[PDB]
Amino acid sequence: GRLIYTAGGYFRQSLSYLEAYNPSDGTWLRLADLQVPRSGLAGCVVGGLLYAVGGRNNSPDGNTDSSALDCYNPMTNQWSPCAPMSVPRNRIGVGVIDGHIYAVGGSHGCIHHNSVERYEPERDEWHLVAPMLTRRIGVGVAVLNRLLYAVGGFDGTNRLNSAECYYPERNEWRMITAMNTIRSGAGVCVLHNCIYAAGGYDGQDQLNSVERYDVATATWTFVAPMKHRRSALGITVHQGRIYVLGGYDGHTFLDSVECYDPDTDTWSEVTRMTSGRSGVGVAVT
Ligand SMILES: CC(=O)N1CCC[C@H]1C(=O)N[C@@H]1COC(=O)c2cccc(-c3cccc4nonc34)c2CSC[C@H](C(=O)N(C)C)NC1=O
Numbered sequence: 001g002r003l004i005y006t007a008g009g010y011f012r013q014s015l016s017y018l019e020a021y022n023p024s025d026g027t028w029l030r031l032a033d034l035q036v037p038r039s040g041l042a043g044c045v046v047g048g049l050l051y052a053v054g055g056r057n058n059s060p061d062g063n064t065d066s067s068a069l070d071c072y073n074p075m076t077n078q079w080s081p082c083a084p085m086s087v088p089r090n091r092i093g094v095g096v097i098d099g100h101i102y103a104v105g106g107s108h109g110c111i112h113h114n115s116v117e118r119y120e121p122e123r124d125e126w127h128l129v130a131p132m133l134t135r136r137i138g139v140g141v142a143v144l145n146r147l148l149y150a151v152g153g154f155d156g157t158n159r160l161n162s163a164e165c166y167y168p169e170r171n172e173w174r175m176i177t178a179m180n181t182i183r184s185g186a187g188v189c190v191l192h193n194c195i196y197a198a199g200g201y202d203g204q205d206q207l208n209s210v211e212r213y214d215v216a217t218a219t220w221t222f223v224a225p226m227k228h229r230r231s232a233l234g235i236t237v238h239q240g241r242i243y244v245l246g247g248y249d250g251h252t253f254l255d256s257v258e259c260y261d262p263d264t265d266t267w268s269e270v271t272r273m274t275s276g277r278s279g280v281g282v283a284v285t
């Protein structure tokens with residue numbers, strides 16, 4: 001029994017929602033709210049615990065970038081604060097290698113980070129690792145072959161189609177083949193040994209196109225596009241399928257949840273979130 005969790009997001013302001021979707025029966029669970037609202041955060045799971053990393057709290061009274069790391073226990077329905085990151089990281093990308101959380105890029109006011117840091121739950125400590133070759137906010141992150149890939153994003157001046165790879169044993173970054181499309185705020189995940197980059201923003205329009213990276217051929221190829229154009233979407237993999245949750249299409253905050261079946265190369269709307277939102281953190285446990 002595994003659930004798709006969605007934490008935070010944005011609709012008029014940053015949200016505290018923590019909701020879980022059960023793909024087997026189509027039900028939505030309303031769980032304990034985040035202590036501090038956040039959009040542009042990322043979610044991940046380590047040892048059956050859900051983590052909400054970074055983001056920013058946008059309120060009609062003012063905005064605050066977050067360096068926070070919070071931990072949710074599904075068995076207790078409780079959030080617990082963890083050690084914060086060295087810097088606030090809004091529009092962050094996160095990846096897990098060997099139970100260690102990597103917080104990648106993101107922004108803090110006028111600063112677009114290339115810095116990357118790693119959290120060890122067993123010690124409750126963050127330590128900086130080698131920074132990326134490019135500053136990246138709205139970066140998609142995927143873990144494949146025990147390497148951490150940072151895909152697309154925005155460097156402060158340009159929207160990116162470039163992507164790079166981190167080798168944890170060597171503590172170094174290398175540029176890989178660039179995507180066909182410039183994407184900032186895309187959903188990046190790994191399914192069947194491929195990295196998928198779905199949606200995002202190319203500097204002019206929100207995208208519905210989806211491309212996947214094959215490591216053996218080192219090429220990015222387009223697969224079937226989503227029904228809705230979306231940036232700042234949440235993304236996850238559950239039982240061999242890709243799930244995209246919410247986002248922003250340029251005017252509307254989507255409640256649509258689409259599901260990609262790699263066998264048929266088709267997307268279908270499987271459910272709707274309880275309300276439309278963008279910039280959510282998503283994870284499965
Ligand atoms: C104009 C503007 O940016 N806004 C003014 C008030 C604050 C702020 C505001 O509305 N943000 C909320 C939240 O959204 C996210 O959390 C969020 C999270 C993760 C990634 C991204 C993202 C998408 C596309 C390219 C990106 N390159 O880097 N990150 C990218 C976003 C922003 S989606 C764009 C939409 C917007 O511009 N509106 C006007 C509503 N923004 C949002 O939905």
Ligand SMILES: [Cl-]
Binds near residue numbers: 039040056058
């Ligand atoms: Cl924002």
